[PDB]
Amino acid sequence: ETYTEDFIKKQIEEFNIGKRHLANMMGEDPETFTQEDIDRAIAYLFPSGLFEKRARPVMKHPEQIF
Amino acid sequence: TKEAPETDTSPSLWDVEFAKQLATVNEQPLQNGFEELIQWTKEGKLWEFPINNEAGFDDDGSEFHEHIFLEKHLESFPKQGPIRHFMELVTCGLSKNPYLSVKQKVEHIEWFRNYFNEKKDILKESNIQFN
Amino acid sequence: EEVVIPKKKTWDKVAVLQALASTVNRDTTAVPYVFQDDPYLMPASSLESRSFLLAKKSGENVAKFIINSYPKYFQKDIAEPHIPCLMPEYFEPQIKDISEAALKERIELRKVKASVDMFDQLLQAGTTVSLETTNSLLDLLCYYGDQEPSTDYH
Amino acid sequence: VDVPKDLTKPVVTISDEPDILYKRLSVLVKGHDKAVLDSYEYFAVLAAKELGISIKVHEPPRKIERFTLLQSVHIYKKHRVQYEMRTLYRCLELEHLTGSTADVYLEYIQRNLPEGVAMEVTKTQLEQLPEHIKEPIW
Amino acid sequence: KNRAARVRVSKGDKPVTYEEAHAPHYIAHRKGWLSLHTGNLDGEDHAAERTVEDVFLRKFMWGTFPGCLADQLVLKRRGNQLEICAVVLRQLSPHKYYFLVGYSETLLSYFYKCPVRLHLQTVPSKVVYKYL
Amino acid sequence: LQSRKEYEQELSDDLHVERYRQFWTR
Amino acid sequence: ERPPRRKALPPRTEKMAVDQDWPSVYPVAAPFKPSAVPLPVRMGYPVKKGVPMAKEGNLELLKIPNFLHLTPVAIKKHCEALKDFCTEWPAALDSDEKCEKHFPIEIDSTDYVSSGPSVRNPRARVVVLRVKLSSLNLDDHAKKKLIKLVGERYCKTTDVLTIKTDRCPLRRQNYDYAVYLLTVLYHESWNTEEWEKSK
Amino acid sequence: SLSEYAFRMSRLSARLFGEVTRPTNSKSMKVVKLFSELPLAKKKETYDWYPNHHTYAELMQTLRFLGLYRDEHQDFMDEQKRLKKLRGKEKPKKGEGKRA
Amino acid sequence: HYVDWRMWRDVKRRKMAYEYADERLRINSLRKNTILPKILQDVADEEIAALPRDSCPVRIRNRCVMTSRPRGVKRRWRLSRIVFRHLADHGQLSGIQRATW
Ligand SMILES: [Mg+2]
Ligand SMILES: [Mg+2]
Ligand SMILES: [Mg+2]
C-alpha cells in the first residue's frame, strides 16, 4: 500500500468531518474538542478490553496514523 | 346505549372477522428499534424487565405452609411406632425440598401408604399394625 | 412520629420502552427500519421497496410452512416463561368420532369441506344437532361462500 | 419540519397502595472485559445522577479460574495447554430507593446491559414489625 | 510445533483475514471472541447449552448461505435476545439475501424458542488483512 | 450404657397447627 | 444481463449533518454498522509499516459491545422521560438510623440477569430476614430464651438476628416463611414452660 | 452431652424450624437427605446431557431435501458413493450378499 | 442419528433411569435406615434388584456431546478435551482464553 498525498489529503478531510460528528455525540463544543477528548469518547463508545493498546479502536490524525 | 351487552354469548365469526379488519387499518410496519421490542414484549417473545426469575412460574398458587407442614397427609399412617418415625423423616425431608411441588410431595407420601397396605402381613409379624 | 410513604405508581409492562421511544425521533438519512441498513441491501426504488418486503415475508411464510409440515423437530420448549406464539400450529382435527362435540372442533378450524361433510353424516346418523352448532356452521359457510380458506400449501 | 404535533405519553397511574422502600441496591455486574464494565459504569452512574439517585461505585477484586488440558490428542502427558476465564466485577451501591424508583432504574439499565455481562442485584427491603408481634398473646 | 488454528505460511499469495491470521494466544490480546454470552462467567449456569447452540448456528449459517459468508460469525446474547452478525459478499442478489434473512430469523426463533435477529454487513470482496 | 430420660421421650407439641395457626395470614 | 452488476449505494454517513440528532441514528442497542457510523474509527493490530484496518469490513469493531446507543446526550434525554415513572423518597428518613427506628426489619432478595432462553435461577428463591432484638418488645426472660432457640442465627456483636429461608420453591413463599419464623420465635420465647425451672 | 434445659431447648428449636425432633442416628438421617434433594437421574443435567441428535440431524436432512440447506459434508459422500458405483464397488443387496 | 452405538446406549440408560428415578428413590429409602424392621428391608432389597439393570444411575457415563469421547470431558461444557480446544482456540467460546501468568 502506497499512500499518495491526494489520499492523505482526503483522510484529513474525513477526520475533520468525523471529529465534529464525534463531538455531537458526546454533547461537547466541536471547536474546543481536543485529541484527549477523542480517546475518551472512543473508549466509551467502543469499549475494548484487548490487552494490547494498539489493537483497540483508535481515531487519530492521519499524519500520526499513516 | 345498551345497558347489558351480551358478553356471555360467544361472538360469531362475522364479528371476529370484522374486528380483524379494524386492526388492519391501524397496522403499520416497524419504524425503529423501540417498536420491535414493544411488539415482542406484547407478544411475549421478549422477557419482561426488570428481570424476575419466577416470571410465569407459580406452582398452583401454593402457600408456604403447604410445602412445609405435611402432617395433614399422615393421618392414615399409625400415630406411633417405627412407621410414624420413618414417615416423620420423609416429611421432614420433603419439607426441605424446593424442587418438588405440593402435588409431587403428596405422591411420595401416598406411595408409602399404598406400599404398607400391600405389606400389612409382613408388618403384623413384626408387631406393627397398619390400618 | 409518623412517616409518610408515597403512593406506588403502576405502569404497563411496555410503558418504559414507549417512554424511551419518545426521546428519539425518526431518522431522515435512513431507509425504513424493516429493510436492512446496509448500502448494498438498502432498497433503491419504490419497486424494490415493495419487492424486498414481499421477499422477506416470503421467507417467513416458507419457514412457517416447514414448522407446520414437520412439527416434531420444534416441540422441545426450553423458553422460560413459555412462549405460545413460538410453537407449531396444528390445523388437523384430533377427534375422529362422529358427534356434535367433535364437529365443533372442525368448525373452529374453519374446515368448511370437513364440517359440511360431517354435518350431513351426523344428520344421517339421526343424532340431533344443537341450534348454536348449526348457527355456527352457517356463519363459517356464509362468510367463506362454501369455499376453503386460503392455506400455505396442500 | 416534519416533527410530531402532539405526543401521547405513556399512561402512569398513581395507585392507592403504599409503595415499597428499598434501603440499598448492590448492583454487581460481572464480565470478561474491563472496558465494557467501565463503559457500563459510566452509563449507570450518569443515569442515576439524572434521576436523582444516590450511587456509590467500587470495584470488587477480580476472580480468575484456570484449568489444565492435554495438548496432544494422543499421549505426550508432559505437554499441556492452560486456559483461563477472567471474571471482572463492578459494584453499584444505590441507597434510599422506593419500589417504583428502583423498578424503573433497573429496567432502564438491564435492557441496556451489554452482551457477555451478567448482573446480580441484591435488594434490601425495609418493613415494619408484623401486627402479630406488636404484643404477646399469652 | 503448535498447529492449532495457525495458518501456515504460503509463498505470499494466500489471503487471510484478521481473525484467521492470529494464533490462539491472541484471543485476549489482539482479537476478541466470536461469541459473547454469560455462560462462562463465574457462578453462571447453562454453559454447556450455549456452546451447543453456538456450534449449530455456525454450521446452519454456513449451509443457509453457501459461499456467501466472507468471515466468521459474531454471536451476541442480551437476555432473551439473540443477535447474529455476519459479513457476506455482494454476489448473491438482494432478493435472495432478503429471503434467507426472513427464513433464518423465523426458523431459528421457533427452533430455540427465543427471538433472533440477523444482521448482514455486505462487503465488495473478502477483506484481506495480510498475504501469507 | 444406654441413657434414657423422661423428658427425652416427650413428643414436641405441634404448636404450628394448634397454637400458631392464626399467624399464617397477615 | 440487461443491467450491469448491482452497485452498492454510497453510505448514508455522508448525508449526516454535523448537528444531527445522533440518538435517532441509534435508538436501541444495535451492532456496529460501518455505513451508519460517521466516524473514521480504525481497529486492529497494524502490520509493519501498516495502519489499523478500516471500519468497513472490520470484524473486530463488530465484536465490540459498542455504547453508540447510550451516548451522554441520549442518557440525559432518556432520564427526562423517566422522571414521571419514579416516586419521591421520604424526606423523614434522612439517615440510616431514622430508617431503623421506623423500619427495624430488613428483607434481602436477589435477582439475576443472564443471557439465554431460560430465566429460571434457583438462587433467586433465597430470602434473608434481619432484625435487631433491641427493637423487639422483649423482656429479660424471652430475650435469653430467644437467643438459645435461634443458636448462631443471632450475632451478639451487632445484636442482629438473621433468618435464612430457602425451603419453598418461590421467593414469596420463602418471604412468608421468614416472617412466620420470626412470629413463632418471638411468641415461643415469651412462653414460659414448666421444664424451664431446671435451668 | 447436654443438660435437661439444653436438650429440651434444642428439641424445641427443631420443632420451630421444622428439623428432626425425635432422636435419629446418622444412618437414618440419610432418608431426610434423600427426599430433600432431587435424585441424580432427575437432575436436568442427567436426562438432558445430550442434545437431541435425532432432532438436529433429521432437521438438517429435511432442510437439505427442501433445498434451503446445502450440506457440503453430505454432498462429499454422495459424490464419493457415486464414483464407487461407476468403479463397481457398489453396496451388495441385503440377504443376497457375496456369502450365502 | 447419534455419534455411535455407545452414545445411543447411554441415552437409553439416561432415559430409563429418569423414568425409574422416583420409584427407585422410594424403594431405596426403606433400605437406608435402621427404623424399619429387617424383614421389610429385605423385601425392599429384592424389589429394587428386580428393577431393570439400565435404570441404575451408576451405569450412566458422562460422554462428550459432540464426539462421544468417554474420558477427558469437561463437565461444565460437556465436551471432550480435543473438541473443547478446537472451539476455544478459534475464539468461539465466550470468555475463554489462553492462560499465561
Ligand atoms: Mg511445545
Ligand atoms: Mg459412522
Ligand atoms: Mg462411572
Side-chain angles (χ1 to χ4, degrees):
Chain A
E1 303 176 3
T2 300
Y3 309 96
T4 178
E5 184 178 9
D6 187 15
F7 181 77
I8 304 301
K9 180 181 179 181
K10 296 182 178 181
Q11 294 295 150
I12 300 185
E13 179 182 2
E14 294 179 355
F15 170 79
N16 300 336
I17 296 178
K19 184 178 180 180
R20 301 184 64 85
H21 288 55
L22 180 58
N24 175 82
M25 305 176 184
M26 308 300 295
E28 305 185 10
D29 184 63
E31 309 294 335
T32 60
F33 211 77
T34 54
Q35 174 66 21
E36 302 82 359
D37 305 325
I38 299 180
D39 293 335
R40 185 186 68 258
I42 283 298
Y44 167 78
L45 289 181
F46 308 98
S48 179
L50 297 179
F51 291 143
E52 294 190 359
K53 295 185 177 180
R54 290 183 290 182
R56 304 178 185 180
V58 59
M59 177 185 175
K60 294 177 176 180
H61 200 258
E63 301 292 340
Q64 299 178 0
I65 296 181
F66 294 86
Chain B
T1 56
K2 189 179 183 183
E3 301 180 357
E6 298 183 2
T7 59
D8 305 0
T9 300
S10 58
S12 61
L13 180 57
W14 293 85
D15 310 330
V16 176
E17 291 291 340
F18 184 83
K20 296 179 58 181
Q21 305 178 4
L22 301 185
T24 300
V25 301
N26 204 30
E27 175 185 359
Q28 291 294 331
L30 303 175
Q31 304 296 334
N32 51 26
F34 285 111
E35 293 178 4
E36 186 174 12
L37 303 183
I38 295 177
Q39 186 180 7
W40 282 356
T41 309
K42 294 180 177 181
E43 296 177 6
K45 311 181 65 177
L46 184 59
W47 284 354
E48 304 180 3
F49 287 86
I51 290 297
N52 176 29
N53 301 109
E54 306 177 354
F57 176 72
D58 196 1
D59 46 355
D60 310 329
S62 300
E63 302 294 335
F64 73 100
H65 55 76
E66 295 180 7
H67 287 273
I68 300 177
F69 306 108
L70 296 175
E71 303 300 330
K72 59 185 299 179
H73 305 276
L74 295 186
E75 303 291 338
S76 302
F77 292 86
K79 307 306 175 183
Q80 302 296 336
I83 294 185
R84 187 69 176 193
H85 188 192
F86 177 82
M87 292 305 303
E88 277 191 3
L89 297 182
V90 174
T91 54
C92 176
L94 292 175
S95 61
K96 300 184 179 183
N97 197 326
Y99 313 106
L100 297 181
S101 61
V102 182
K103 180 174 301 180
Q104 292 173 342
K105 293 176 182 177
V106 175
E107 297 180 9
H108 291 275
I109 302 178
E110 294 175 349
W111 186 89
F112 294 101
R113 186 181 66 90
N114 299 330
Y115 184 87
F116 291 148
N117 274 319
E118 305 293 337
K119 302 295 182 300
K120 286 181 302 182
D121 309 331
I122 302 178
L123 297 176
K124 289 179 180 179
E125 296 189 5
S126 55
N127 305 329
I128 303 180
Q129 177 184 0
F130 185 81
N131 297 21
Chain C
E1 184 180 4
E2 184 69 24
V3 290
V4 282
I5 299 180
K7 290 296 182 179
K8 169 188 174 183
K9 294 184 180 180
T10 59
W11 58 88
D12 197 2
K13 57 182 178 181
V14 300
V16 174
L17 293 178
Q18 294 179 356
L20 290 182
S22 61
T23 61
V24 303
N25 303 26
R26 189 186 59 182
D27 190 82
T28 60
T29 62
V31 295
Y33 173 78
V34 285
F35 305 99
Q36 295 288 351
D37 192 2
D38 184 81
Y40 175 84
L41 300 176
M42 279 194 308
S45 69
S46 181
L47 171 62
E48 284 184 356
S49 176
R50 292 179 295 270
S51 69
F52 287 159
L53 295 182
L54 293 171
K56 185 177 183 178
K57 294 175 183 178
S58 180
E60 302 186 9
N61 299 325
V62 167
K64 287 291 299 180
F65 168 78
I66 308 175
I67 304 162
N68 308 326
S69 306
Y70 309 88
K72 48 193 173 187
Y73 304 148
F74 308 86
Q75 284 167 355
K76 184 175 185 177
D77 180 68
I78 58 180
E80 297 290 337
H82 182 82
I83 308 180
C85 59
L86 282 185
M87 299 301 300
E89 294 177 334
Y90 302 96
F91 310 99
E92 301 175 345
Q94 296 189 9
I95 305 182
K96 302 178 181 180
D97 187 12
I98 310 176
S99 64
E100 171 187 336
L103 179 56
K104 294 179 59 179
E105 179 186 3
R106 296 177 177 85
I107 302 174
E108 297 291 341
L109 302 176
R110 301 180 182 181
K111 298 290 186 178
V112 287
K113 299 303 177 182
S115 58
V116 67
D117 293 359
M118 185 177 180
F119 180 81
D120 302 4
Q121 293 178 4
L122 186 145
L123 188 58
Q124 289 292 337
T127 55
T128 176
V129 53
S130 181
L131 177 58
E132 302 182 13
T133 300
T134 309
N135 292 332
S136 300
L137 176 57
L138 292 180
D139 307 356
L140 176 63
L141 294 181
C142 291
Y143 187 80
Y144 292 87
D146 296 332
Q147 292 188 2
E148 302 180 358
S150 297
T151 53
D152 297 326
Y153 183 83
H154 178 56
Chain D
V1 285
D2 194 9
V3 297
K5 305 303 178 182
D6 298 327
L7 297 177
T8 298
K9 62 183 302 179
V11 176
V12 176
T13 304
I14 306 178
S15 175
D16 300 327
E17 178 182 5
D19 199 359
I20 298 179
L21 294 181
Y22 292 115
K23 180 180 182 178
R24 296 166 304 179
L25 291 190
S26 299
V27 176
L28 171 63
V29 286
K30 308 176 299 181
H32 302 285
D33 192 310
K34 186 182 177 183
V36 180
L37 296 177
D38 292 355
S39 298
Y40 189 69
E41 172 185 347
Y42 182 82
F43 158 76
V45 169
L46 184 59
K49 301 306 180 183
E50 290 286 346
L51 291 175
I53 290 181
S54 178
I55 175 178
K56 304 179 64 178
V57 186
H58 73 271
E59 176 178 350
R62 69 180 182 184
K63 180 176 182 181
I64 299 179
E65 176 183 353
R66 301 181 178 92
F67 51 93
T68 305
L69 264 61
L70 277 174
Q71 186 165 25
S72 177
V73 298
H74 194 246
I75 58 180
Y76 301 152
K77 186 62 168 299
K78 302 192 300 93
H79 304 270
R80 317 289 191 85
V81 182
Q82 296 174 334
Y83 299 88
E84 67 177 358
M85 294 174 297
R86 301 194 181 186
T87 301
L88 309 179
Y89 296 83
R90 189 63 46 86
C91 184
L92 307 173
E93 294 192 6
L94 307 176
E95 297 186 357
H96 298 356
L97 295 195
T98 60
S100 300
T101 305
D103 192 303
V104 185
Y105 184 85
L106 284 179
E107 176 168 2
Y108 178 52
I109 67 173
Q110 284 180 359
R111 291 184 181 270
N112 294 326
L113 190 60
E115 56 274 19
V117 177
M119 180 183 304
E120 304 178 356
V121 183
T122 300
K123 307 186 299 182
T124 294
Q125 178 180 357
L126 296 179
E127 288 291 339
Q128 298 180 4
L129 299 175
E131 302 175 354
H132 301 285
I133 324 189
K134 299 296 181 178
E135 296 179 358
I137 64 179
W138 309 99
Chain E
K1 306 185 299 181
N2 301 21
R3 319 274 296 185
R6 290 174 173 82
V7 180
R8 307 252 75 99
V9 287
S10 179
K11 303 178 180 180
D13 53 352
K14 180 189 299 178
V16 291
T17 64
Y18 186 86
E19 320 298 327
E20 303 177 2
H22 293 298
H25 65 277
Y26 291 143
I27 313 176
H29 312 267
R30 306 180 181 182
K31 51 180 293 185
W33 296 285
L34 300 173
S35 180
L36 287 172
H37 56 69
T38 68
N40 293 324
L41 287 172
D42 178 69
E44 299 289 337
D45 307 330
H46 307 272
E49 284 77 6
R50 301 300 91 90
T51 296
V52 180
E53 297 178 2
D54 294 2
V55 172
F56 172 77
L57 289 187
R58 302 191 183 278
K59 302 180 63 61
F60 177 82
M61 292 283 298
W62 189 252
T64 310
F65 297 80
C68 303
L69 297 177
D71 203 351
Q72 296 293 339
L73 305 182
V74 176
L75 302 178
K76 305 176 180 300
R77 289 184 173 90
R78 299 185 308 275
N80 195 21
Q81 300 178 19
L82 171 61
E83 294 187 351
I84 305 178
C85 305
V87 179
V88 297
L89 295 175
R90 296 176 176 175
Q91 297 178 358
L92 212 61
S93 58
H95 289 75
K96 295 185 176 182
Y97 270 123
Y98 266 97
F99 176 86
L100 300 181
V101 170
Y103 153 74
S104 55
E105 284 181 7
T106 302
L107 184 69
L108 294 175
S109 297
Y110 280 75
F111 187 81
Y112 283 142
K113 313 301 182 180
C114 64
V116 175
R117 283 205 295 261
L118 178 57
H119 304 267
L120 293 183
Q121 174 186 345
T122 64
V123 290
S125 63
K126 187 176 185 179
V127 188
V128 183
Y129 166 74
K130 66 186 298 183
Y131 289 84
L132 290 176
Chain F
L1 297 179
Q2 302 168 354
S3 299
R4 295 188 174 185
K5 304 176 183 179
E6 301 179 1
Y7 65 92
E8 296 188 352
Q9 304 171 351
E10 296 182 354
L11 297 177
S12 57
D13 180 72
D14 195 354
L15 75 172
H16 303 265
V17 179
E18 300 183 358
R19 297 181 58 182
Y20 300 148
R21 193 180 189 92
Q22 62 178 2
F23 295 151
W24 290 358
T25 58
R26 293 185 175 181
Chain G
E1 45 165 3
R2 308 181 185 180
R5 294 304 306 271
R6 194 184 192 276
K7 179 177 183 178
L9 307 180
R12 61 190 184 96
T13 59
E14 306 177 2
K15 301 182 59 181
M16 302 181 181
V18 298
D19 58 333
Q20 66 169 344
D21 183 68
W22 177 247
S24 299
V25 189
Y26 269 88
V28 300
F32 177 81
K33 295 171 294 185
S35 62
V37 181
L39 297 175
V41 52
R42 296 176 174 267
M43 181 184 180
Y45 189 83
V47 298
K48 288 83 180 174
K49 291 186 177 181
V51 297
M53 302 183 60
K55 58 173 182 177
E56 295 83 358
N58 195 339
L59 199 64
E60 292 296 330
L61 290 173
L62 191 52
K63 296 182 298 183
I64 286 192
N66 59 92
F67 279 76
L68 297 170
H69 63 290
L70 300 178
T71 46
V73 181
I75 298 179
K76 302 181 180 181
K77 191 183 307 176
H78 291 174
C79 301
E80 184 67 25
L82 300 183
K83 293 184 177 182
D84 303 334
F85 284 80
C86 299
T87 59
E88 175 186 356
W89 169 265
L93 303 177
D94 180 72
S95 61
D96 292 332
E97 177 64 26
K98 298 179 179 179
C99 298
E100 173 187 339
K101 178 184 175 181
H102 304 74
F103 300 93
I105 298 184
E106 297 179 356
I107 306 298
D108 287 339
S109 59
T110 312
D111 291 333
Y112 300 86
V113 186
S114 300
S115 58
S118 180
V119 82
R120 300 292 182 266
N121 198 326
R123 313 176 190 88
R125 72 185 186 278
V126 175
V127 174
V128 177
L129 180 147
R130 293 190 311 269
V131 54
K132 297 184 182 177
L133 296 191
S134 61
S135 60
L136 299 184
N137 190 24
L138 286 173
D139 62 321
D140 304 328
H141 170 265
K143 182 176 182 178
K144 296 178 184 302
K145 185 178 179 177
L146 179 54
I147 300 178
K148 295 183 175 301
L149 281 172
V150 299
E152 296 186 11
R153 298 175 179 84
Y154 167 75
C155 179
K156 190 173 183 178
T157 301
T158 56
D159 197 69
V160 174
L161 173 64
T162 296
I163 300 180
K164 183 175 183 177
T165 62
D166 56 351
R167 295 188 175 189
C168 300
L170 297 181
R171 172 166 46 183
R172 60 168 190 86
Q173 302 180 356
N174 290 323
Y175 171 80
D176 301 328
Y177 185 46
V179 176
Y180 175 75
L181 282 187
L182 181 58
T183 309
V184 174
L185 283 168
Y186 178 90
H187 288 62
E188 185 65 20
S189 307
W190 272 92
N191 176 28
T192 307
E193 295 293 334
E194 300 182 5
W195 57 265
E196 299 189 13
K197 300 179 182 179
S198 61
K199 187 177 186 180
Chain H
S1 58
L2 302 176
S3 174
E4 176 180 1
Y5 179 82
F7 185 87
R8 304 195 61 161
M9 188 66 61
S10 63
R11 185 180 59 179
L12 178 58
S13 60
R15 176 59 67 181
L16 302 186
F17 288 91
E19 305 174 15
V20 181
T21 57
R22 302 186 181 185
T24 297
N25 51 4
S26 60
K27 288 187 172 183
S28 298
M29 286 300 302
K30 184 176 180 57
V31 185
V32 186
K33 297 183 179 182
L34 288 182
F35 290 89
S36 64
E37 306 174 355
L38 289 177
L40 184 62
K42 295 293 292 183
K43 296 180 181 178
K44 189 176 182 180
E45 176 179 357
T46 301
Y47 62 85
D48 276 357
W49 177 269
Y50 302 102
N52 200 330
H53 283 263
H54 289 349
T55 301
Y56 279 99
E58 294 177 19
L59 169 64
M60 310 319 294
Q61 180 183 14
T62 297
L63 290 180
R64 178 175 180 262
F65 294 158
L66 298 179
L68 293 177
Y69 174 81
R70 180 179 299 179
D71 197 325
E72 295 181 353
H73 182 93
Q74 186 64 221
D75 294 334
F76 181 83
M77 289 188 298
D78 293 355
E79 180 69 17
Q80 292 299 327
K81 184 181 302 181
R82 183 187 67 89
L83 298 181
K84 298 189 64 178
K85 295 185 60 179
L86 295 175
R87 197 163 62 255
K89 304 293 186 179
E90 196 174 353
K91 182 178 186 61
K93 300 298 298 180
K94 190 176 184 305
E96 190 185 1
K98 298 182 178 181
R99 290 177 298 180
Chain I
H1 288 93
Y2 285 92
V3 177
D4 48 358
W5 299 93
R6 305 169 189 178
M7 170 175 284
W8 169 246
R9 288 205 301 268
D10 191 26
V11 178
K12 294 161 56 183
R13 292 184 173 93
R14 296 181 184 267
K15 183 176 183 177
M16 181 180 301
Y18 177 74
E19 299 177 12
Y20 285 90
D22 286 330
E23 182 176 358
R24 197 182 195 90
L25 168 64
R26 299 164 184 174
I27 299 181
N28 195 22
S29 58
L30 313 170
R31 314 168 61 259
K32 303 297 182 179
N33 61 94
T34 67
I35 303 176
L36 295 180
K38 291 292 182 179
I39 319 175
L40 190 59
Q41 299 186 4
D42 295 357
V43 180
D45 292 8
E46 301 180 9
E47 291 182 4
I48 196 167
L51 296 176
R53 181 68 62 89
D54 288 357
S55 62
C56 307
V58 191
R59 297 175 64 88
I60 302 179
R61 180 74 171 191
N62 294 18
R63 312 177 66 93
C64 174
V65 304
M66 298 287 99
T67 54
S68 178
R69 205 187 192 278
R71 301 184 183 94
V73 181
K74 302 297 298 182
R75 189 165 191 165
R76 190 174 189 179
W77 303 274
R78 310 175 189 176
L79 305 180
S80 70
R81 56 175 184 86
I82 308 177
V83 177
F84 177 85
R85 289 192 56 207
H86 178 66
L87 301 179
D89 292 3
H90 289 65
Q92 298 182 5
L93 293 181
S94 179
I96 303 184
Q97 65 197 39
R98 290 295 178 90
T100 57
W101 78 103

